[PDB]
RNA sequence: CAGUUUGAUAUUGGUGUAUGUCUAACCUGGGUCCGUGAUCCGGAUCAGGGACAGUGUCUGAUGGGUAGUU
RNA sequence: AAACGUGUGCGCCGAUUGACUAAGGGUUCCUGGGUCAAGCUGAUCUGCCCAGGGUAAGUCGGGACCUAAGGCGAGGCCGACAGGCGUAGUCGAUGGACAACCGGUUGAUAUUCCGGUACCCGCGAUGGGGUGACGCAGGAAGGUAGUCCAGCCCGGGCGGUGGUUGUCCCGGGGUAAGGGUGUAGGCCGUGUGGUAGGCAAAUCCGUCACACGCUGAGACCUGAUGCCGAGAAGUGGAUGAUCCUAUGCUGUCGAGAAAAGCCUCUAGCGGCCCGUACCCUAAACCGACUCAGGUGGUCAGGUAGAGAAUACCGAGGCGUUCGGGUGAACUAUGGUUAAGGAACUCGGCAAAAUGCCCCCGUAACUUCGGGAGAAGGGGGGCCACUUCUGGUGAUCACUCUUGCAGUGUGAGCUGGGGGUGGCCGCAGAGACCAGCGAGAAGCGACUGUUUACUAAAAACACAGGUCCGUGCGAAGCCGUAAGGCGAUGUAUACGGACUGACGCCUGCCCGGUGCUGGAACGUUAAGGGGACCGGUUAGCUGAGAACUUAAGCGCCAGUAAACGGCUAAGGUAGCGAAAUUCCUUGUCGGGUAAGUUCCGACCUGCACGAAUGGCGUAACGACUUCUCGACUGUCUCA
RNA sequence: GAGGACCGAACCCACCAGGGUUGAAAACCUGGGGGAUGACCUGUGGUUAGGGGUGAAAGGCCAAUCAAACUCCGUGAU
């Protein structure tokens, strides 16, 4: 049937955006963990 | 008046709807409207705090004058009596005599072509707005303002009616809709005659989905939910709660006006 | 324990016979004006309420609404 | 070389196995080369590997224009900190405003390039006013796109086999945006004066007194001496839309965005950025796969048919993605079965049967709508003659207001209806498609919703009923607070609780618990008070009684459509072996040859009962139970 | 020419049966079946978050997981 996952740029930038990540600074310590880790990627 | 169905269908059998003789025209008046978007019975943070509303009917807010207090000695005319969703009473149009044109709720009588003034020099018959002290003793009024220039509080729906009772300095008694004496100052303005539409409350509304349209959502009953739910949720087959009954919350039954609010030296009898 | 609620006390004053009255603290989600293009906010100014209410500390009552467990 | 290319044939899809678009994918598109990895076999082929190439915009979609739900938010409010809310503003299309069509071309792009002809951008406000500006349903009319036919026009052909120079056969009978014109349809009073209102003004809007043209499908011309076309003709008629007139018209209640833009009033030679390939009912997206699943929107032909169903076809595409044989048992998907016809079984589960249009006819009961397509019965093909009747509209005249008019006239074309006779077959709704019907009981009034992935129900909801709370900064709810919803609502309104259409009704109990009201009096915390008794050598200091006080509780009344019960009162009305009855397969009657089930009664109610409603109820039900007719491989029995 | 009207495709759903059950599919296929102008279905954009949301109420749903989601940390819990 509907799988979960119907794809969309547009509301996979206004959820897990860069920008959405540093509204708030419990998602800015996400942005930081993951430099310090060195993902390539580092947002959505 | 009202209008009963023929018992065509299932649904339609038994109901009944308002027969609409009243209403002059079916538009409004352009200038006078206002957007006004369903809010669902949810508040600033999206969470439901009234429950059972949403999904109504598409509406558009009439700007009406509940105030009438700066057209003191300006004549106006009835031009229309219009068909308001947003209240059970309807809307008339007044063309005031210097261009002006405002609604008011319709009160009972008042009909298309009709002379009405406002201010202390008014005559006393349906439609006119006065101080409570211009008003006398004994008549019916509505729309009362509870502060001076407040705006109009009291009696507002359809068939409403208040009935003055004594003028005491600054104070007046008034017998409320409700059957509560309640004092307000003199100073306070109300418009004469009782509010039309008075058959409204015996519509019968026949199907669920006229109640959808109004934007009622369905009810659910606490003893068919689970004990998580609500306390009179549970038990095996039909309950009646097993206990006192309480809001989903847990409050019980009982009186929940603020003993120690302001008002109450304002009331002189409760209904 | 949250919540609801009682009293004392601080904010809290004048004056008369537990209870009146006054205005000045305090409250108006009352009117009008300005910042100002502005239903937020603040400052004026009239209109009221008024040492009451709200709030802090202390205190009795209720408290499966919630929480920890037997 | 079964699979790669070309040709022929055959079959399949065709409201899609065709042609596009958004989202998504991200080079899978084209050329050339390869066959090691991948392809559920194979490969010279590939959506695979390597190299190279390919996406052209003033007019298409979006940005530089507007705003909705909502987000962020200068100051700001609130909050121990973190942080929450929010004003001015600023973002935010899924909507509004805004200028291009036809044809050709490459291997890959085309409303983007090319050809032709077009179009838009380069005094007056941000303030006022008008407009923008709006639901749902329904029919009719006028048109066009498309389609069909033709004895007509143009181009071909004379038939491998009986006949085909003939109202015989095959193929084609087009052309856009823009401009000119202004029809059918729809809408609309003009002007003078005064003018408390539109934050200042207004000659504009509104209000008062007085006197008395706009838009618009389409037809025609131009665009077009062009382009297209089997380089000819490029006409006429019929039919006809889900498309246009139409944001129209009529009806109706549930009463149906904002801003920009445009108009008006006063105050005072250039034309930018992103997308443009390719896939898109799927072999390129979401499902781990080249997955029998899912995926919004547009295009929509012929014959039969009411139809976008269904059968065969068109435009166009596919037959590649393991094959070749062989009558084993057995399994699955289809098919037919003599005589019997539910005897199978928990149960008619499954299958069978009915099935279409027209006409006749239709019961109990009923809330008068219904039941009802009740049940049941008749006609159905083709040919000829005959009879009646729509639409269209040339020609013929006449009339005007002299036109894109009108009114008579009826050729040709084309629906529809009724009789008479005849012909063929086993069969005329001949294929595909296409209701089984009846009687009774239980529950729920009804349409609906529900346990995504074993329960669709008698469960939830519902319209209706009652009770309780709320006087507006309402009650209730989210939040520590601010602030919000309730509500731009106001006792005929809102919230909470139970019952659940409709009809007749809803009995007794306030002793318990809860709720409402009253508090004389008893008890009672903090606080006030500090009697009196101690330590030390009047002072300091420890413990500290009497007395003073509120809620609450004890107490007094009411309240059961409050939780509850039937001494506080002991079950009324109604029903009753029941969705409840153990004993139990109670007893009697009916149904059957045989009835632990079913229907009607009795009443010994283990253990019914009145808004956790009692008793009934027309209609309804993929609900449960019983019975009967039709029908059948369910069964004898395969 | 009204209707939470009737029959019936698209669309939404899932009552019955058979198949599938290391399936073509971690819920589907075939034939029947219900609604099909409304309390309807659907696209795009928003929004409600864990003792919390939402719920025509099944403890249902909240990324194949729900009588309290998932991830990291206390943590090498017991």
Same mark, same amino acid.
């Given at each position: 049937?509907?799988?979960?996952?119907?794809?969309?740029?547009?509301?996979?930038?206004?959820?897990?955006?860069?920008?959405? #990540?540093?509204?708030?600074?419990?998602?800015?310590?996400?942005?930081?963990?993951?430099?310090?880790?060195?993902?390539? #990627?580092?947002?959505? | 008046?009202?209008?009963?169905?023929?018992?065509?269908?299932?649904?339609?059998?038994?109901?009944?709807?308002?027969?609409?003789?009243?209403?002059?025209?079916?538009?409004?008046?352009?200038?006078?409207? /206002?957007?006004?978007?369903?809010?669902?019975?949810?508040?600033?943070?999206?969470?439901?705090?009234?429950?059972?509303?949403?999904?109504?009917?598409?509406?558009?807010?009439?700007?009406?004058?509940?105030?009438?207090?700066?057209?003191?000695?300006?004549?106006?005319?009835?031009?229309? &009596?219009?068909?308001?969703?947003?209240?059970?009473?309807?809307?008339?149009?007044?063309?005031? !005599?210097? =261009?002006?044109?405002?609604?008011?709720?319709?009160?009972?009588?008042?009909?298309?072509?009709?002379? &009405?003034?406002?201010?202390? =020099?008014?005559?006393?018959?349906?439609?006119?707005?006065?101080?409570?002290?211009? &008003?006398?003793?004994?008549?019916?009024?509505? !729309?009362?303002?509870?502060?001076?220039?407040?705006?109009?509080?009291? !009696?507002?729906?359809?068939?409403?009616?208040?009935?003055?009772?004594?003028?005491?300095?600054?104070?007046?008694?008034?017998?409320?809709?409700?059957?509560?004496?309640?004092?307000?100052?003199?100073?306070?303005?109300?418009?004469?005659?009782?509010?039309?539409?008075?058959?409204?409350?015996? &519509?019968?509304?026949?199907?669920?989905?006229?109640?959808?349209?109004?934007?009622?959502?369905?009810?659910?009953?606490?003893?068919?939910?689970?004990?998580?739910?609500?306390?009179?949720?549970?038990?095996?087959?039909?309950?009646?709660?097993?206990?006192?009954?309480?809001?989903?919350? =847990?409050?019980?039954?009982?009186?929940?006006?603020?003993?120690?609010? !302001?008002?109450?030296?304002?009331?002189?009898?409760? /209904?």
């Amino acid at each position: 049937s509907k799988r979960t996952f119907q794809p969309n740029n547009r509301r996979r930038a206004k959820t897990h955006g860069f920008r959405l #990540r540093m509204r708030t600074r419990a998602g800015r310590a996400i942005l930081a963990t993951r430099r310090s880790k060195g993902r390539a #990627r580092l947002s959505a | 008046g009202i209008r009963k169905y023929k018992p065509t269908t299932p649904g339609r059998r038994g109901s009944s709807v308002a027969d609409f003789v009243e209403i002059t025209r079916s538009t409004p008046e352009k200038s006078l409207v /206002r957007p006004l978007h369903s809010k669902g019975g949810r508040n600033n943070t999206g969470r439901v705090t009234v429950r059972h509303q949403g999904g109504g009917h598409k509406r558009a807010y009439r700007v009406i004058d509940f105030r009438r207090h700066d057209k003191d000695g300006v004549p106006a005319k009835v031009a229309h &009596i219009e068909y308001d969703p947003n209240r059970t009473a309807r809307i008339a149009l007044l063309h005031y !005599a210097d =261009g002006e044109k405002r609604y008011i709720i319709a009160p009972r009588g008042l009909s298309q072509g009709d002379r &009405i003034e406002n201010g202390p =020099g008014a005559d006393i018959k349906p439609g006119n707005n006065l101080a409570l002290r211009n &008003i006398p003793v004994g008549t019916t009024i509505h !729309a009362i303002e509870l502060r001076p220039g407040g705006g109009a509080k009291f !009696a507002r729906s359809a068939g409403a009616s208040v009935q003055l009772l004594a003028k005491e300095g600054s104070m007046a008694h008034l017998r409320m809709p409700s059957g509560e004496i309640r004092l307000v100052d003199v100073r306070c303005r109300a418009t004469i005659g009782e509010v039309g539409n008075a058959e409204q409350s015996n &519509i019968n509304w026949g199907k669920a989905g006229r109640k959808r349209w109004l934007g009622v959502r369905p009810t659910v009953r606490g003893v068919a939910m689970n004990p998580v739910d609500h306390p009179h949720g549970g038990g095996e087959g039909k309950t009646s709660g097993g206990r006192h009954p309480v809001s989903p919350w =847990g409050q019980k039954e009982g009186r929940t006006r603020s003993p120690k609010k !302001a008002s109450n030296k304002y009331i002189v009898r409760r /209904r």
